[PDB]
């Protein structure tokens, strides 16, 4: 549900397939919240803001 | 124990929550709201009269040593009164924490300027204004810093559309670079991707 | 001049529209009667004024506000209209 | 109905910080045409001017009056420091862009758009 | 590819094409749908 | 190996395309099979990042190895299907054996 | 295969091909209007039916992970072959 | 003495930088989306959303593709509340046209009406 | 608290009627249950099992759908023992369940894939061979891919329960238990494509939508039906610019959830036969293209050399009320009176004055609400469909007693068909019917005349045999003044807007002054032609189908389609709704209203309004409700027109009633769109010989 499956279970299995299908197409629901995360790039603190 | 779900420490929600209790019972005349997210960060909600109050007391007090703002940013959300949040994000590297300042504002009420606490904020709260058309007292210079010269609009809000509203091109007869109405070739073809399925009860709101 | 067309705009329930509706109930069957090649057109509405439009030959037309009006004042409005 | 100012408590000094940034536009417009190489007459871009603040002239409310003198303000010191190039000042004429007729009958010739 | 050849489809070309813009062969794009909108033919027979 | 698209005209590829570079119109066949119509990738527009191709669920469109295909005029990087289904017959030795080599890691 | 218009201009596997009167046949002229040799109809058409015994058959285009998805065909019409949606081969079940 | 008042409209449409033709002649629609009908999940006809007039789409000459004129044509905007969607519409000056929300009415269900005994609602397959 | 029950939903309190299952509880908390086989408006049929939830201090879970709760039961929606039952069940659907969601139609359109993400688990554990099922061929409209059916059964429910078919069932039994018809069966009646809505698998897709576009492709616009005069909302699923699908809007006082199959599948008609460019005739008299500024140039001068009399108009079925009221001007600035519609209602009496005379005054909620039902000379199921519909609801639900005077066609449900003659009214007036002792059994009677009754040619003297029954009725019966006995059920979209704006309806004013210009609003009906109009006579056809009226007409104008401008039109119940624009109309076609107003400017009488809010309070000043958007105000004075219409003195005819659409192979062609549409070709075709 968030990452996609391999491509033989994508091909071989029903769950995988609509999994495969709704991360492509829709994406993953992320759950509602705010986040900074930094992190030591090499230039300094690249940080990201996320709502 | 579980390997794809995120380990959770309660310490560190421990403490942001008697350092939150503790900002809280200092500043009770600008502060709005407190709260902790379960991601462990700190969130303190103020009134915009003590935007100077509360980060020079950050900055400067012994206990916070929030000397290093993180970043500054507006976010708009265009269904309430006061459209654009406003948020401060800080580290303290002598407690080697980080803290999250919010207030509040809309497009008539200019707040309070913070680059006699920060002077990153200078550049910061240029872009603010840029994007989002939220004016700062007591700014040196408050100009554009990222919008070309001339720019109608701050393009960061909700309402402005995503191609904005002018194209330049060369024109040939004038020998410039001119400014027309927006015209695409193909249109920005927009999806409806949300899932008519509730995803999380956790965050189901109340029926109106 | 040249009457061709009229329209009486009323509420179902309002104190300025009672008169119309009296009038309408006791008095359109006999005007009907009187003139049975004219359209008068009795449209009823929640939130409009009491109203009357007499339409004329080359699309002239006249608006006579009959707010709080009397049964026999819009009759006489009427014939005022019908008249000249 | 009660709000915080901005700069100016009422109409009037609202309208005395316009006339101040409009003297300042009619003084610099001048020394725009002569250092950036205009084609236009100084007369052409005081009328410029003039049509920039009579299209906003329509306006009662003392702190959308008080942004507009500040942006007013931004475009004055982007054209005193010279950051707006030729282009740039050049794009309030729109002397490239044909204007879209107002009357019924060519707006129904050219296309649906109202 | 002598020691270890591809696999032989009927579909591949047989002959290889190097760049060819700025040439008459060159590619040239066009929609490849149909006209989805027809337009009434009026009649060929006057009515009167 | 039929000689039958791959392409079933499921437009996955144009739904996850970060660029909005595809644009894919469909109808059935004369067969009654599901295939496209018009397949048009704007290579001015592609960023180049492989997401149709990990999102095509028959491994129809592909990014084969050719990077030697620099134009003179802008309308030819506008791809269409002809376009693409020759460049996919051209490079079928190369593309076939670059799947074969990498399709167990993905 | 490919048939060309009266035009002259090649029809393309979709039908496509631009109208005599059509002003956008010169982006042609001087140039080609490229036009894909193989017909995918039609190669689907040579292929041959497969003959299979079970009631249920699948499909998943050959090479196994190199195909498409997995789907099972019903040979249960004795009258038509089942083809399968994606590759579009075709089956029958043999009852003899 | 910091504090005055204002009897007026909230105009900002002098400080948003829109032309006046996409103020002026445009019209927005505010309403709560419809469920559809291809689904029976109703997780998005909870927020209100204020949309634009559709304008014209003509075919690219070149490609076949979807040309538009119009900025405001991929805009649509949330609202937690119809009366937070009106403040928003009159303060950047759109006109607007409000649809009230279109809340399914309450059904009496009941699983033994399928097996009626003498009215109609008795089913005759399951 | 009266006759309410308490009950909490994860401990939250709430008060519901008794009989309230657990799934309306949570629904009115505010929370979704799973579902697969339960839908709102079909029967409970309790067996896909996604809806299992766990009731506090109880060891089994619960079907949501079907089981009501009690008194004090804890519903815990989210328990672990519920998110369990949810994972097991999305488990078995999807262990046969076929990998085909690329090339299935419903692909972000899937409750089965939605409810899978949501609820189910991330993978598979099934490692045998899945089962496959061969298709059926129930008709060209839906197409079945039977291998992706989860054997819900709300299609066999919705065929039989509000289709009114019996079609469908399950053949078979265990993992082999098949949907469908057991003989090759056309599945063919109206209302015939909500399977296609309310399959939540791609098993029943549509066929003309097939492989076509993608749900987060289409932009979705809101809009009203124009097919019928019930006024069905609708959204119009549009792609780049192109109209792609038509779907149901939820209204409970239209149309519920359903369209017509005519409404779902004629839009494609609207891709052909389409005026695109302004015509004029020749020299020779053939039809040619010219400009915008010739064509009207050409009216106008026509317009201005006519006087009043001379100059006549008659409207379509598919034309808007702001084209109508801007016609109407027109012709009244060049003093001209004969603004005829194509539709026929009576003039004497009353007529037109009184709204309640041409209305469905008792309105579709009146239906639900109604205890006998007499329609006559209509066939309701053709004529409207979700009328109809909302029939055999209150058939089903409250037992509602219906009977038809007419010739005897079937309705989908069992009535009492009186007779066809039209002395039948003057029996029933009279009181010596078996029908007249069920009516004065009868507590809250709705009277339905068919406007297609009021065609013929003593539809005077059926309106005012009418007027007299329900006039019986009511002192009879003692019926309260709030019911509104007296209802007309009309089948042309512009015909109430044409009523409400004073268009004299039917076209007996053209023949008795034959006009020397004539405009043609959308008139493809062929009620007026060249053989009883004058020989010079200047005909100009302002629409957008060249069917009947494009072919005779001097000028062509091309006009706007109800998706392509946003358009006011007024339904059966007087309730006005308006149509948005989906997408532009093609070439140099522009929006009705438009064009009259252009064409009243180059004739030099403007019209006072130059945009659409400026012509919505032209029709606002001639008649107030047409701004009234879903506003459904009430009507009166059915005295007032009972008396006029008792004063008129008509004679009713000997004829039977037969209604013009007899068979669905009637009912698939009616106006320019469905004759122009590929799509009602193939049913008729398939209704006729396949
Ligand atoms: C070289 C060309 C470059 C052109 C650059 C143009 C610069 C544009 C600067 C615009 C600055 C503004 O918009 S400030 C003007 C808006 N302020 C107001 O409207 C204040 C209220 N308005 C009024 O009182 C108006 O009646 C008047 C006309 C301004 C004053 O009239 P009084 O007489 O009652
Ligand atoms: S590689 Fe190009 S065409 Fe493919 S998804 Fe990425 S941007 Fe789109
Ligand atoms: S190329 Fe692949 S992902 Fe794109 S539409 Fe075709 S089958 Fe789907
Ligand atoms: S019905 Fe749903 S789960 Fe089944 S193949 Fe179609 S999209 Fe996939
Ligand atoms: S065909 Fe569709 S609606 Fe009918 S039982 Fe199967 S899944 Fe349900
Ligand atoms: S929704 Fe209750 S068992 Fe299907
Ligand atoms: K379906
Ligand atoms: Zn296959």
Same mark, same amino acid.
């Given at each position: ?13 029903? +769950? ?23 992190? +030591?790039?090499?230039?300094? +603190? ?6 | ?80 009164? /006061? ?54 007292? /007591? ?70 | ?26 008095? @359109? ?26 339409? @004329? ?28 | 109905? $009660? ?102 009958? $060519? ?8 | ?9 009927? =579909? ?5 094409? =190097? ?30 | ?57 028959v491994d129809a469109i592909v990014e084969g190895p050719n990077f030697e295909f620099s134009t003179e005029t802008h309308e030819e990087l506008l791809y269409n299907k002809e376009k693409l289904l020759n460049n996919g017959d051209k490079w079928e030795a190369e593309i076939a054996a ?9 | ?96 | ?126 | ?13 709430? *008060? ?22 339960? !839908? ?9 099992? *996604? ?38 069940? *999305? ?126 492709? #289409? ?177 089903? !639900? ?146 957008? !189908? ?64 130059? #945009? ?79």
């Amino acid at each position: 549900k968030v990452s996609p499956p391999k491509r033989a279970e994508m091909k071989t299995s029903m +769950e995988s397939l609509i999994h495969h299908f709704k991360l492509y197409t829709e994406g993953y629901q992320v759950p509602p919240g705010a986040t900074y995360t930094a992190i +030591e790039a090499p230039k300094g +603190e690249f940080g990201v803001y996320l709502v | 124990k579980r390997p794809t779900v995120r380990p959770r420490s309660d310490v560190t929600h421990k403490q942001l929550s008697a350092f939150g209790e503790y900002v809280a019972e200092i500043l009770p005349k600008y502060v709005q709201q407190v709260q902790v997210s379960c991601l462990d960060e700190l969130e303190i909600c103020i009134h915009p009269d003590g935007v100077i109050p509360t980060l020079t007391f950050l900055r400067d007090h012994t206990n916070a040593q929030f000397k290093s703002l993180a970043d500054l940013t507006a976010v708009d959300v265009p269904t309430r009164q /006061n459209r654009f949040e406003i948020v401060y994000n800080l580290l303290s590297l002598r407690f080697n924490s980080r803290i999250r300042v919010k207030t509040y504002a809309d497009e008539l009420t200019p707040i309070d300027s913070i680059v006699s606490v920060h002077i990153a904020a200078n550049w910061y709260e240029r872009e603010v204004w840029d994007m989002f058309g939220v004016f700062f007292f /007591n700014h040196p210079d408050l100009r554009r810093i990222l919008t070309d010269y001339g720019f109608e609009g701050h393009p960061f809000r909700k309402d402005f559309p995503l191609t904005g509203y002018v194209e330049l091109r060369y024109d040939d007869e004038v020998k410039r670079v001119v400014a027309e109405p927006v015209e695409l070739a193909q249109e920005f073809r927009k999806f409806d991707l949300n899932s008519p399925w509730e995803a999380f009860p956790a965050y189901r709101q109340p029926p109106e | 001049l040249g009457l061709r067309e009229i329209r009486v705009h009323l509420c179902q329930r309002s104190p300025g529209s009672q008169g119309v509706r009296d009038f309408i109930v006791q008095r @359109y069957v006999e005007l009907k009667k009187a003139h049975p090649n004219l359209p008068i057109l009795i449209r009823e509405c929640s939130e409009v004024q009491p109203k009357l439009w007499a339409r @004329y030959a080359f699309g002239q037309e006249k608006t006579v506000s009959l707010n709080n009006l009397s049964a026999d004042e819009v009759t006489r409005a009427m014939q005022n209209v019908l008249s000249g | 109905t $009660s709000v915080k100012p901005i700069f100016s408590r009422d109409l009037n000094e609202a309208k005395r910080r316009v006339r101040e940034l409009y003297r300042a536009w009619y003084r610099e417009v001048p020394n725009t045409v002569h250092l950036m190489q205009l084609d236009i007459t100084v007369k052409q871009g005081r009328d410029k001017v003039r049509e920039m603040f009579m299209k906003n002239a329509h306006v009662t409310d003392p702190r959308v009056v008080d942004l507009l003198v500040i942006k007013g303000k931004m475009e004055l010191q982007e054209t005193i420091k010279v950051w707006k190039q030729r282009t740039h000042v050049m794009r309030f004429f729109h002397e490239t862009e044909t204007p879209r007729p107002k009357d019924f009958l $060519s707006k129904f010739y050219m296309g649906h758009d109202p | 590819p002598t020691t270890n050849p591809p696999t032989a489809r009927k =579909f591949i070309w047989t002959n290889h094409k =190097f760049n060819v813009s700025a040439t008459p062969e060159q590619y040239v794009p066009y929609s490849t749908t149909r006209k989805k909108i027809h337009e009434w033919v009026p009649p060929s027979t006057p009515y009167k | 190996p039929s000689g039958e698209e791959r392409c079933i005209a499921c437009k996955l590829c144009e739904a996850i395309c970060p660029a909005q570079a595809i644009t894919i119109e469909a109808e059935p066949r004369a067969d009654g099979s599901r295939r496209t119509t018009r397949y048009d990738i704007d290579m001015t527009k592609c960023i180049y990042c492989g997401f149709c191709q990990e999102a095509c669920p028959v491994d129809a469109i592909v990014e084969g190895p050719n990077f030697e295909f620099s134009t003179e005029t802008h309308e030819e990087l506008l791809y269409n299907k002809e376009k693409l289904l020759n460049n996919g017959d051209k490079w079928e030795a190369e593309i076939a054996a670059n799947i074969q080599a990498d399709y167990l890691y993905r | 295969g490919v048939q060309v218009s009266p035009s002259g201009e090649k029809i393309t596997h979709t039908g496509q091909v631009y109208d005599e009167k059509d002003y956008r046949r010169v982006r042609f002229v001087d140039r080609q209007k490229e036009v894909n040799e193989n017909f995918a109809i039609d190669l689907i058409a040579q292929q041959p039916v497969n003959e299979v015994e079970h009631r249920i058959i699948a499909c998943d285009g050959g090479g196994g992970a190199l195909g498409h998805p997995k789907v099972y065909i019903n040979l249960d019409k004795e009258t038509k072959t089942g083809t399968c949606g994606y590759c579009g081969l075709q089956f029958k079940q043999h009852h003899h | 003495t910091q504090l005055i008042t204002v009897d007026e409209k909230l105009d900002i449409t002098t400080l948003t930088g829109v032309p006046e033709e996409h103020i002026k002649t445009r019209k927005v629609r505010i309403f709560v989306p419809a469920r559809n009908n291809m689904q029976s999940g109703v997780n998005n006809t909870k927020k209100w959303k204020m949309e634009f007039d559709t304008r014209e789409r003509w075919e690219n000459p070149l490609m076949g593709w979807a040309s538009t004129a119009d900025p405001l044509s991929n805009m649509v905007l949330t609202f937690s509340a119809k009366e937070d969607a009106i403040a928003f519409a009159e303060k950047n000056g759109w006109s607007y046209d409000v649809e009230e929300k279109k809340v399914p009415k309450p059904k009496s269900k009941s699983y033994g009406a399928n097996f009626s005994w003498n009215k109609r609602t008795r089913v005759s397959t399951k | 608290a009266s006759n309410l029950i308490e009950v909490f939903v994860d401990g939250q309190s709430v *008060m519901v009627e008794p009989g309230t299952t657990v799934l309306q509880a949570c629904e009115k908390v505010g929370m979704q249950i799973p579902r697969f086989c339960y !839908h709102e408006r079909l029967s409970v049929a309790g067996n896909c099992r *996604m809806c299992l939830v766990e009731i506090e201090k109880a060891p089994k879970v619960v079907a949501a759908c079907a089981m009501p709760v009690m008194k004090g039961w804890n519903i815990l929606t989210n328990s672990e023992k519920s998110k369990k039952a949810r994972e097991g069940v *999305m488990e078995f659907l999807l262990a046969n369940h076929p990998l085909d969601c690329p090339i299935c139609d419903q692909g972000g359109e899937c409750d089965l894939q939605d409810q899978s993400m949501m609820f189910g688990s991330d993978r598979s554990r099934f490692l045998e061979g899945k089962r496959a099922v061969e298709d059926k061929n129930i008709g060209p409209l839906v197409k079945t891919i039977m291998t992706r059916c989860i054997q819900c059964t709300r299609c066999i429910r919705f065929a039989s329960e509000i289709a009114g078919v019996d079609d469908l069932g399950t053949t078979g039994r265990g993992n082999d238990m098949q949907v469908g018809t057991y003989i090759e069966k056309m599945f063919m009646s109206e209302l015939s494509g909500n399977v296609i809505d309310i399959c939540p698998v791609g098993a029943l897709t549509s066929k003309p939508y097939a492989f076509t576009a993608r749900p987060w492709e #289409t932009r979705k616009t809101e809009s009203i039906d124009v097919m019928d005069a019930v006024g069905s909302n609708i959204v119009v699923s549009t792609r780049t610019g192109e109209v792609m699908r038509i779907l149901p809007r939820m209204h409970e006082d239209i149309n519920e959830e359903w369209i017509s199959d005519k409404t779902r599948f004629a839009y494609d008609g609207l891709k052909r036969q389409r005026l695109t460019e302004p015509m004029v005739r020749n020299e020779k008299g053939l039809l040619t293209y010219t400009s915008w500024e010739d064509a009207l140039s050409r009216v106008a001068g026509m317009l201005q050399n006519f006087e009043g009399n001379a100059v006549a108009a008659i409207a379509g079925g598919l034309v808007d009320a702001e084209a109508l009221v801007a016609l109407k001007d027109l012709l009244n600035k060049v003093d001209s009176d004969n603004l005829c519609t194509e539709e026929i209602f009576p003039t004497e009496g009353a007529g037109t004055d009184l709204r309640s005379n041409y209305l469905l005054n008792t309105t579709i909620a009146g239906v639900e609400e109604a205890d006998v039902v007499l329609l006559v000379g209509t066939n309701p199921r053709f004529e409207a469909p979700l009328f109809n519909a909302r029939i055999r609801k209150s058939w089903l !639900h409250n037992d509602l007693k219906v009977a038809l005077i007419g010739s005897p066609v079937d309705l989908t449900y069992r009535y009492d068909h009186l007779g066809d003659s039209p002395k039948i009214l003057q029996d029933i007036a009279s009181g010596r019917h078996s029908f007249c002792e069920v009516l004065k059994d009868a507590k809250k009677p709705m009277v339905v005349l068919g406007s297609s009754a009021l065609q013929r040619d003593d539809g005077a003297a059926i309106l005012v045999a009418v007027s007299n029954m329900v006039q019986k009725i009511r002192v009879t019966t003692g019926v309260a003044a709030e019911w509104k006995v007296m209802n007309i059920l009309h089948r042309i979209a512009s015909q109430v807007a044409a009523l409400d704006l004073g268009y004299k309806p039917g076209v007996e004013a053209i023949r008795k002054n034959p006009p020397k210009m004539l405009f043609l609003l959308g008139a493809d009906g062929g009620c007026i032609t060249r053989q009883d109009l004058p020989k010079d006579c200047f005909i100009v056809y302002q629409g957008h !189908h060249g069917d009947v009226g494009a072919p005779m007409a001097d000028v062509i104008l091309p006009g706007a389609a109800y998706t392509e401008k946003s358009a006011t039109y007024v339904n059966t119940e007087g309730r006005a709704q308006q149509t948005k624009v989906a997408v532009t109309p093609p070439g140099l076609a522009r929006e009705d209203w438009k064009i009259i107003r252009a064409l009243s400017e180059i004739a030099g009488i403007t019209l006072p309004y130059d #945009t659409l809010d400026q012509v919505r309070n032209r029709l606002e000043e001639v008649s107030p409700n047409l701004v009234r958007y879903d506003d459904i105000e009430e009507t009166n004075y059915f005295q007032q027109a009972s008396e006029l219409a008792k004063l008129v003195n008509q004679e009713v005819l000997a004829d039977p009633l037969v209604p013009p659409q007899l068979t669905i192979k009637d009912f698939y062609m009616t106006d320019s769109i469905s004759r122009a549409s590929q799509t009602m070709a193939k049913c008729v075709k398939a209704v006729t010989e396949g």
